[PDB]
Predict the structure.
Amino acid sequence: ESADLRALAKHLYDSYIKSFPLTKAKARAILTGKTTDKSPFVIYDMNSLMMGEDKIKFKHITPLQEQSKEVAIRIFQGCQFRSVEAVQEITEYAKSIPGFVNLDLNDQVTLLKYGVHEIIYTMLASLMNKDGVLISEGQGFMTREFLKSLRKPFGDFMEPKFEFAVKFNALELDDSDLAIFIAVIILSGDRPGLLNVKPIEDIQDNLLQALELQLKLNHPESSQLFAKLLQKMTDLRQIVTEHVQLLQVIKKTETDMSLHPLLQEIYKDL
Amino acid sequence: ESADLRALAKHLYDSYIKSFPLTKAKARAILTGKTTDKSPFVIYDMNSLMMGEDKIKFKHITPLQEQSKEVAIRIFQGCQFRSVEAVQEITEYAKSIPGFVNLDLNDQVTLLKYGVHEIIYTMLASLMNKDGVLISEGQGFMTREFLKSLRKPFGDFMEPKFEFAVKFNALELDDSDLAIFIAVIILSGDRPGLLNVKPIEDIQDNLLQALELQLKLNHPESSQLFAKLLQKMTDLRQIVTEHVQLLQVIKKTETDMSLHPLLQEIYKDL
Ligand SMILES: CCCCCCCN(CCc1ccc(O[C@](C)(CC)C(=O)O)cc1)c1nc2ccccc2o1
């Protein structure tokens, strides 16, 4: 019954709105302007960066950065903190996916460990366009060029996210679509180390039917959107793998820089 | 129309049968199961290999294990010969895909270039089970044990493919399904360097529709098989990536000597 699938879709969309403070709808409203209400301050260089810590709250350094925790590192610990923040929002969302909390506690942990970053990059795309990305709840906007100009290793951390975002965003998905998609990502029975794969795949199948109908009803004219979206899951895994190896490089070139315990746990070069 | 999709399906199945000697239906009869007659020669040890090699249809080298070209190298090289063969079979199959030959020639070469490894492992799964893989047109069977026991570098070469095959084969696809799936892989759109993505994605759209109808008619009891199959591409990709990686490492094993050229030419890297 497609009626039961529509309810699941509404339920997941509802939980999504309740778990994620900055939706795609809000992100696009901020980026596309035509607004005086919430135009973001723009960071495209060191100076605007300094200024940025004025109209927008930023627990980081404004002045000199070199001999005082450089800008690259400052921006990096910022992403770090924001990522853990996202893991907590995604975890809250996960618990709302029917069946998720009734699974083996060990597998709940495994599903989150492997799904969190894939979800992070999917949602990160909502806050990006070809020119940059929204920051601090949408009050700021850091330029893609400014980011690609950071010190040797940090200079290329974000580029692959942008490359993915521009392609992914061309699919023109809205929050109700993404809510089902993120749920699908989490319930992957092919995650390494899962104990009970069957209960996980039973839920994903239900989620997949939900996503399929949702895309057919919401995008009547977009041929094979469902399949096209599912293939994007390959680009996500790649982004993760690529990010991981870059993180191993960072770890060795910056022995004075620290990683958040949560993020470190999830990570295992995995 | 459902008619254009069935025709496309039937057309691909026919060309697939004509292009690939060993069909999965053919290989499954041999593997797990009997169909008692002409049982494959089993390579499970060094002695069984030496014997099988000198008694199998392997046009290349003979058994010589004594400070002269180790077994692992001869096995590895052997898989290279068969891979070059398959590439030509994949190439002929590609040309039968409606619209393929009509694409920009550089684009045709690009699609084949980046799609042959994904296709090779996909079809390899057809000849594998959890304990081994069919060899020499199915006249042989090299056990998973003997393979994982090879030298340090070569022992971890095929294992990852066995793991993928185990999961992939659980989908229980047959040649009619695989025929369309392989064509979808070939007509990707995200291969690097493509010049005209539109016609490529347009054909894949048509192929995906065909694959979807085929799975629903051929496996009416398998819910969301279409979606599950597409997500298996995330695995194939990692496999390929991980594979070119070990490959580079192998290069850092065997190298020198003015003997073997022209042969090294015929292979390169694929
Ligand atoms: C439901 C989840 C919503 C996810 C929203 C993510 C916003 N974000 C963080 C993106 C990110 C960047 C870098 C990351 O690297 C770390 C922290 C490295 C340990 C990781 O977790 O792998 C991880 C995640 C982010 N936003 C921005 C804006 C500008 C510059 C950098 C930046 O990073």
Observations:
- Residues 180 and 248 of chain A are 32 Å apart (CA to CA).
- The domain at 1-270 of chain A is CATH 1.10.565.10 (Retinoid X Receptor).
- Chain A is about 60% helix and 5% strand.
- The first helix of chain A runs from residue 2 to 19.
